[PDB]
Design an enzyme around this catalytic site. Sequence first.
Site, PDB file in Angstrom:
ATOM      1  N   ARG A  77      15.252  13.332   1.933  1.00 40.74           N
ATOM      2  CA  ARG A  77      16.600  12.625   1.944  1.00 40.74           C
ATOM      3  C   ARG A  77      16.720  11.688   0.644  1.00 40.74           C
ATOM      4  O   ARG A  77      15.896  10.998   0.184  1.00 40.74           O
ATOM      5  CB  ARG A  77      16.661  11.849   3.198  1.00 40.74           C
ATOM      6  CG  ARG A  77      16.914  12.297   4.307  1.00 40.74           C
ATOM      7  CD  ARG A  77      17.160  11.432   5.696  1.00 40.74           C
ATOM      8  NE  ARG A  77      16.218  10.689   5.926  1.00 40.74           N
ATOM      9  CZ  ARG A  77      16.091   9.205   5.322  1.00 40.74           C
ATOM     10  NH1 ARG A  77      16.931   8.719   4.656  1.00 40.74           N
ATOM     11  NH2 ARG A  77      15.040   8.422   5.746  1.00 40.74           N
ATOM     12  N   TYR A 216      16.554  20.388   1.527  1.00 44.49           N
ATOM     13  CA  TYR A 216      15.529  19.905   2.329  1.00 44.49           C
ATOM     14  C   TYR A 216      15.863  18.936   3.425  1.00 44.49           C
ATOM     15  O   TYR A 216      16.700  18.356   3.447  1.00 44.49           O
ATOM     16  CB  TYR A 216      14.775  19.006   1.109  1.00 44.49           C
ATOM     17  CG  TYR A 216      13.279  18.618   1.763  1.00 44.49           C
ATOM     18  CD1 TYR A 216      13.362  17.534   2.670  1.00 44.49           C
ATOM     19  CD2 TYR A 216      12.301  19.242   1.565  1.00 44.49           C
ATOM     20  CE1 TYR A 216      11.966  17.059   3.167  1.00 44.49           C
ATOM     21  CE2 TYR A 216      10.964  18.990   1.954  1.00 44.49           C
ATOM     22  CZ  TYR A 216      10.869  17.832   2.784  1.00 44.49           C
ATOM     23  OH  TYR A 216       9.373  17.536   3.124  1.00 44.49           O
ATOM     24  N   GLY A 218      16.395  16.244   6.221  1.00 49.80           N
ATOM     25  CA  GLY A 218      17.559  15.648   6.651  1.00 49.80           C
ATOM     26  C   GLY A 218      18.906  15.711   5.735  1.00 49.80           C
ATOM     27  O   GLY A 218      19.968  15.533   6.082  1.00 49.80           O
ATOM     28  N   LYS A 225      19.764  14.187  11.235  1.00 48.08           N
ATOM     29  CA  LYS A 225      20.254  12.792  10.778  1.00 48.08           C
ATOM     30  C   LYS A 225      21.867  12.755  10.703  1.00 48.08           C
ATOM     31  O   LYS A 225      22.394  12.095  11.325  1.00 48.08           O
ATOM     32  CB  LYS A 225      19.507  12.503   9.562  1.00 48.08           C
ATOM     33  CG  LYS A 225      18.091  12.540   9.694  1.00 48.08           C
ATOM     34  CD  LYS A 225      17.495  11.601  10.893  1.00 48.08           C
ATOM     35  CE  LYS A 225      16.006  11.146  10.734  1.00 48.08           C
ATOM     36  NZ  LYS A 225      15.741  10.315  11.713  1.00 48.08           N
ATOM     37  N   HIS A 245      17.666   5.886  16.730  1.00 44.58           N
ATOM     38  CA  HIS A 245      16.642   6.244  15.999  1.00 44.58           C
ATOM     39  C   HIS A 245      15.348   6.041  16.774  1.00 44.58           C
ATOM     40  O   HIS A 245      14.677   5.239  16.425  1.00 44.58           O
ATOM     41  CB  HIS A 245      16.654   5.921  14.650  1.00 44.58           C
ATOM     42  CG  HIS A 245      15.643   6.234  13.760  1.00 44.58           C
ATOM     43  ND1 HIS A 245      14.951   5.727  12.600  1.00 44.58           N
ATOM     44  CD2 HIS A 245      14.934   7.650  14.003  1.00 44.58           C
ATOM     45  CE1 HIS A 245      14.172   6.482  12.089  1.00 44.58           C
ATOM     46  NE2 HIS A 245      14.227   7.712  12.936  1.00 44.58           N
ATOM     47  N   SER A 267       8.665   2.993  11.039  1.00 47.02           N
ATOM     48  CA  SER A 267       7.342   3.784  10.436  1.00 47.02           C
ATOM     49  C   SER A 267       7.837   5.372  10.225  1.00 47.02           C
ATOM     50  O   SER A 267       8.681   5.666  11.048  1.00 47.02           O
ATOM     51  CB  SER A 267       6.035   3.647  10.927  1.00 47.02           C
ATOM     52  OG  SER A 267       5.210   4.227  10.664  1.00 47.02           O
ATOM     53  N   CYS A 269       5.596   7.717  11.033  1.00 47.04           N
ATOM     54  CA  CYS A 269       4.892   8.454  12.030  1.00 47.04           C
ATOM     55  C   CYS A 269       4.898   7.786  13.416  1.00 47.04           C
ATOM     56  O   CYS A 269       4.335   8.148  14.366  1.00 47.04           O
ATOM     57  CB  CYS A 269       3.423   8.741  11.565  1.00 47.04           C
ATOM     58  SG  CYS A 269       3.403   9.984  10.046  1.00 47.04           S
ATOM     59  N   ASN A 273       3.446   9.184  16.789  1.00 45.11           N
ATOM     60  CA  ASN A 273       2.192   8.829  17.420  1.00 45.11           C
ATOM     61  C   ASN A 273       2.492   8.072  18.709  1.00 45.11           C
ATOM     62  O   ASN A 273       1.873   8.538  19.840  1.00 45.11           O
ATOM     63  CB  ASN A 273       1.502   7.716  16.481  1.00 45.11           C
ATOM     64  CG  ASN A 273       1.208   8.517  15.227  1.00 45.11           C
ATOM     65  OD1 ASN A 273       1.093   9.615  15.239  1.00 45.11           O
ATOM     66  ND2 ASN A 273       0.833   7.901  13.979  1.00 45.11           N
ATOM     67  N   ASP A 294      12.326  11.323  17.843  1.00 42.83           N
ATOM     68  CA  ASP A 294      12.982  10.802  16.759  1.00 42.83           C
ATOM     69  C   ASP A 294      14.526  10.461  17.278  1.00 42.83           C
ATOM     70  O   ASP A 294      14.920   9.153  16.833  1.00 42.83           O
ATOM     71  CB  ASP A 294      13.197  11.889  15.720  1.00 42.83           C
ATOM     72  CG  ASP A 294      13.720  11.604  14.586  1.00 42.83           C
ATOM     73  OD1 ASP A 294      13.279  10.341  14.001  1.00 42.83           O
ATOM     74  OD2 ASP A 294      14.603  12.079  13.968  1.00 42.83           O
ATOM     75  N   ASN A 393       5.851  13.117   1.953  1.00 38.43           N
ATOM     76  CA  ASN A 393       6.999  13.444   2.890  1.00 38.43           C
ATOM     77  C   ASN A 393       6.924  14.955   3.359  1.00 38.43           C
ATOM     78  O   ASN A 393       8.008  15.431   4.219  1.00 38.43           O
ATOM     79  CB  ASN A 393       8.415  13.339   2.205  1.00 38.43           C
ATOM     80  CG  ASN A 393       9.539  13.296   3.129  1.00 38.43           C
ATOM     81  OD1 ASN A 393       9.434  12.794   4.150  1.00 38.43           O
ATOM     82  ND2 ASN A 393      10.826  13.797   2.958  1.00 38.43           N
ATOM     83  N   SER A 394       5.883  15.375   3.413  1.00 38.76           N
ATOM     84  CA  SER A 394       5.692  17.116   3.635  1.00 38.76           C
ATOM     85  C   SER A 394       5.698  17.043   5.301  1.00 38.76           C
ATOM     86  O   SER A 394       5.742  15.823   6.071  1.00 38.76           O
ATOM     87  CB  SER A 394       4.431  17.492   3.399  1.00 38.76           C
ATOM     88  OG  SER A 394       3.467  16.968   3.822  1.00 38.76           O
ATOM     89  N   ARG A 395       6.173  18.155   5.995  1.00 38.84           N
ATOM     90  CA  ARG A 395       6.625  18.204   7.408  1.00 38.84           C
ATOM     91  C   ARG A 395       5.904  19.392   8.012  1.00 38.84           C
ATOM     92  O   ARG A 395       5.469  20.310   7.305  1.00 38.84           O
ATOM     93  CB  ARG A 395       8.254  18.300   7.162  1.00 38.84           C
ATOM     94  CG  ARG A 395       8.793  17.228   6.724  1.00 38.84           C
ATOM     95  CD  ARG A 395       9.030  16.075   7.667  1.00 38.84           C
ATOM     96  NE  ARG A 395       9.513  14.933   6.901  1.00 38.84           N
ATOM     97  CZ  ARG A 395      10.458  13.984   7.544  1.00 38.84           C
ATOM     98  NH1 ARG A 395      10.636  14.098   8.756  1.00 38.84           N
ATOM     99  NH2 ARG A 395      10.843  13.007   6.780  1.00 38.84           N
ATOM    100  N   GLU A 515      -4.862   2.766  21.942  1.00 39.27           N
ATOM    101  CA  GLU A 515      -5.052   1.473  22.702  1.00 39.27           C
ATOM    102  C   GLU A 515      -3.697   0.908  22.624  1.00 39.27           C
ATOM    103  O   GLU A 515      -3.641  -0.109  23.386  1.00 39.27           O
ATOM    104  CB  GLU A 515      -5.784   0.721  21.561  1.00 39.27           C
ATOM    105  CG  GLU A 515      -7.232   1.146  21.285  1.00 39.27           C
ATOM    106  CD  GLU A 515      -8.020   1.516  22.530  1.00 39.27           C
ATOM    107  OE1 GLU A 515      -7.654   1.181  23.531  1.00 39.27           O
ATOM    108  OE2 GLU A 515      -9.135   2.521  22.273  1.00 39.27           O
TER     109      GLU A 515
HETATM  110 MN    MN Z   1      13.621   9.691  12.018  1.00 43.20          MN
END
Ligand code: MN
Length: 603
Positions: A77, A216, A218, A225, A245, A267, A269, A273, A294, A393-395, A515
Amino acid sequence: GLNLNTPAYVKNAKLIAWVADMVALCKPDTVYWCDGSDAEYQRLCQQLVDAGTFKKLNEAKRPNSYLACSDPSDVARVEDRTYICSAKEENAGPTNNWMEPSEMRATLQPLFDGCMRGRTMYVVPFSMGPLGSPIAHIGIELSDSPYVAVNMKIMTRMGKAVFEVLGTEGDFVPCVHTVGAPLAEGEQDVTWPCNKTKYIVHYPETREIWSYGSGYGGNALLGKKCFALRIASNMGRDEGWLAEHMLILGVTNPEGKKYHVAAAFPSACGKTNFSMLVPPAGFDGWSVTTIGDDIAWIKPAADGKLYAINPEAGYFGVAPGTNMLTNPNCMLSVRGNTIFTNVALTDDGDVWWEGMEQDAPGKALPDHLIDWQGKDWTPQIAKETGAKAAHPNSRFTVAATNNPALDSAWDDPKGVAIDAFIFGGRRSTTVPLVTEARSWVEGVYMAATMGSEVVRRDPFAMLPFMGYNMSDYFQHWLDLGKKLAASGATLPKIYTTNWFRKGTDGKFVWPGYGENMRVLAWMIDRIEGKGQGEDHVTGISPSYEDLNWTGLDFSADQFNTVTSIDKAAWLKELELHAELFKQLEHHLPKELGETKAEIERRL
Ligand SMILES: [Mn+2]
């Protein structure tokens, strides 16, 4: 209709008229309407392979998967080229780039004129949200990128089923996208068409999205987005719902009761995660399932409950850092049927990205790779030049159903009732591991002041994605909380979390990843009325004995390190909050100042 190669199942005159206008402007060689079928997907993938945009990966290593690499100018983006062109500048606000709509339209007119010469225009119909959900909305994206078409297939409910919902007169969000690279007669194409000049423009009053020059993420997959956050947040402000978001997860405890949490992290990820978190030892009777990772569309119902849907149908996730330690569900998701963008290529036809070495014997890096630029890559080249094999920023692009922990209601048009919101951030000090807000207003304050370490503020994780004035958005959230309270139902709890408190040695103390279940379980215990905690300046936090430590060696001293509240630390914090509220002074709700004063007075 016939002049546009319009399918017979398209019975929407307004849609056809608009496509005709856009065809007259962009002047594509051909027009193709995407039906969203598997066969069409396979044909387009093969066409991308033939064009060199895709390399097909080794079927024994990653079945029916592809690798695309982009022009180095077109890797993410571009916020500086992203515009909210509301009628009045004040309705874009200080967090958005604005231009007089008439001026931007005159700016884009010559760029889109003939932009698709020598190319196919793909008509990409899609639903954001389960087809026919009352919370869902339809968009149509016109694009000259077959990469956009195949990624939209994965990321949205795409294809001919949309026209059943649209009908003869249904409305839709009009999206127009071009790589900005018209081809002349005899001109040879490149593997990643794009333009150095880019524009990603939103006209909120008309729900229009125009994207020029990028292929690319977004910038070009306009549902994710541009539609799902920027346009949708405007619609939600008008129609009484939220476009956030946020990940959405379901959590079931040993009694079998299920709760749903929506969480916003600044963040890259964090949401993925957390949204696919695997409960660690000591939580054998708990289950975490992913509704989304997301975007959340959240609509209050008559019962005073907030119901969230995930408006996407797949994941468009950041690849670097993903491995079996940090996110095994995500790793399992991308074993096949995935499109990878700008990761590295192994000598045996597989993909690789920084962090996968954590799963390898001796944590050894591959001897050789082809990096995302097509250059040779070795650990020595990396060690001596810092070159990354996979772009930061690879996806990966993968269907939601590839996630083994996908919630069975991920596609439920009614959505899931939200029991708690979580607002995270990265803070070396100041912010404790987890705090529960004492009130809705105090929770909005937490969300408004989210930061990451200097500390960069990202209110609600929406700084790049707000569709209107951030301050009016704050007021939207406050007004929503008043309406919910008025229903008499139990409000969703609001939490702030911080996994990244540092010790005296400058290292992270909270182990994080799985955790984090110990913190999520405290939130569920609180919702159920069983969870205990002590009150401090900003809210209620657990004491050491209020968390389940079974299966984790974590001492009361370490717990103090990541939960201690320091008066002097927070005095500095509020000074930072004041500066933020100065940027967002226009239409800033008074409850934010009143809350800050109460924190000051309490200090
Ligand atoms: Mn996002």
